[PDB]
Design a protein around this ligand. Structure first.
Ligand SMILES: [Cl-]
Ligand SMILES: [Mg+2]
Ligand SMILES: [Mg+2]
Ligand SMILES: [Mg+2]
Lengths: 217, 213
């Protein structure tokens, strides 16, 4: 029920591939191709207080800073123009990525599961109600690793609008209340190692902190 | 309100699927894994929905293992303790799309993970299946037998699959693992009727439809 704890009860996590233009020239072109989609299991969620867990099989774990859009009602094959009506709110997420594994998956034509969909691969902020974000395309996202800025992005740089992404996703996969869509990452993706501290936020709206750990199991 | 295992498709969060797991070499490789969203579930009474972007929708008859306890990095030797029961599933597959995904190194999502891509039987409690490697699975299309398989032919055991999966992805109560398909996969078209079962345990029937929305 309560969206303020959506990661406890939400079933599904859908993530887009590329959705940020580093330069206006990338709008002039990238729009001609649909967004790539992949899934994370509900057990990817790592709410604040829980660690980023480094999978045992990677030597190149990357952060990807992303705005997540939390669905407030069941959303099946909706038009772009109705999509915002299905949104409950937002959360800042990291699409944690085993980049070495991802390269292997791509090369061999394998699913991206071990690269993208492992336990604790979706660190997630507190929920932000949609009332606080009247325009999700006018947000500024930032991420630091051990105090150094690694990603900074404006959601005004998105290739596809959030309503378009919702619509497109909903035509392939029905979204349930409490499902989240991760809407892509600005430039600056890069690695983290054991004991690194990640701090990230949406300016004026939400702050989060995650420590990178190896599992104790 | 209630969340019995008998209705696990209503409340279960996650669906994990293995790639190849039936022996016609393969042992030398770990199992391939991909996900389906909870909205892939199509319980009996709901249609198999043809995605608009495929011209080659395949049935894949599979035994699903429904988890009964939260299962994180469990050893093969304890894996069966985390099972709640079973369900017969179809891993509905846009095979044309899958070929393109493999060639281009894309996720398998549009091929494997679409709305209604997991037709699912009634729940079978674990007590009724003391050995899930001694089952017979069958599938008919318009009354003609198209897949028949023995789960004794599995490459990887169910406990090994549970262990392996649980080391990558924690499984919650009500999550399901689809354990692969025997030979005979093939296409279906609009208005086809699919009947399938686990011999002596469960059967189901589904119509192939285009969405009315
Ligand atoms: Cl995938
Ligand atoms: Mg991403
Ligand atoms: Mg799920
Ligand atoms: Mg399959």
């Amino acid at each position: 029920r309560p969206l303020s704890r959506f990661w406890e009860w939400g079933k599904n996590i859908v993530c887009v591939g590329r959705n940020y233009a580093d330069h206006v020239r990338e709008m002039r072109s990238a729009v001609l191709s649909e967004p790539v989609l992949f899934l994370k299991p509900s057990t990817a969620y790592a709410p604040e207080g829980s660690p980023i867990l480094m999978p045992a099989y990677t030597r190149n774990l990357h952060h990807e800073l992303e705005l997540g859009v939390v669905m407030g009602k069941r959303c099946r094959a909706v038009p772009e123009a109705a999509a915002m009506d299905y949104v409950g709110g937002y959360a800042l997420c990291l699409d944690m990525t085993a980049r070495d594994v991802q390269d292997e998956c791509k090369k061999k034509g394998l699913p991206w599961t071990l690269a993208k969909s492992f336990t604790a691969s979706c660190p997630v902020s507190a929920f932000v109600p949609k009332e606080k974000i009247p325009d999700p395309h006018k947000l500024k996202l930032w991420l630091k690793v051990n105090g150094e800025l690694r990603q900074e992005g404006e959601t005004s740089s998105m290739i596809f609008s959030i309503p378009y992404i919702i619509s497109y996703v909903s035509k392939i996969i029905t979204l349930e209340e409490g499902d989240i869509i991760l809407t892509g990452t600005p430039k600056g993706v890069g690695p983290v190692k054991e004991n690194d501290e990640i701090e990230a936020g949406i300016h004026g709206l939400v702050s989060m902190t995650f420590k990178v750990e190896k599992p104790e199991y």
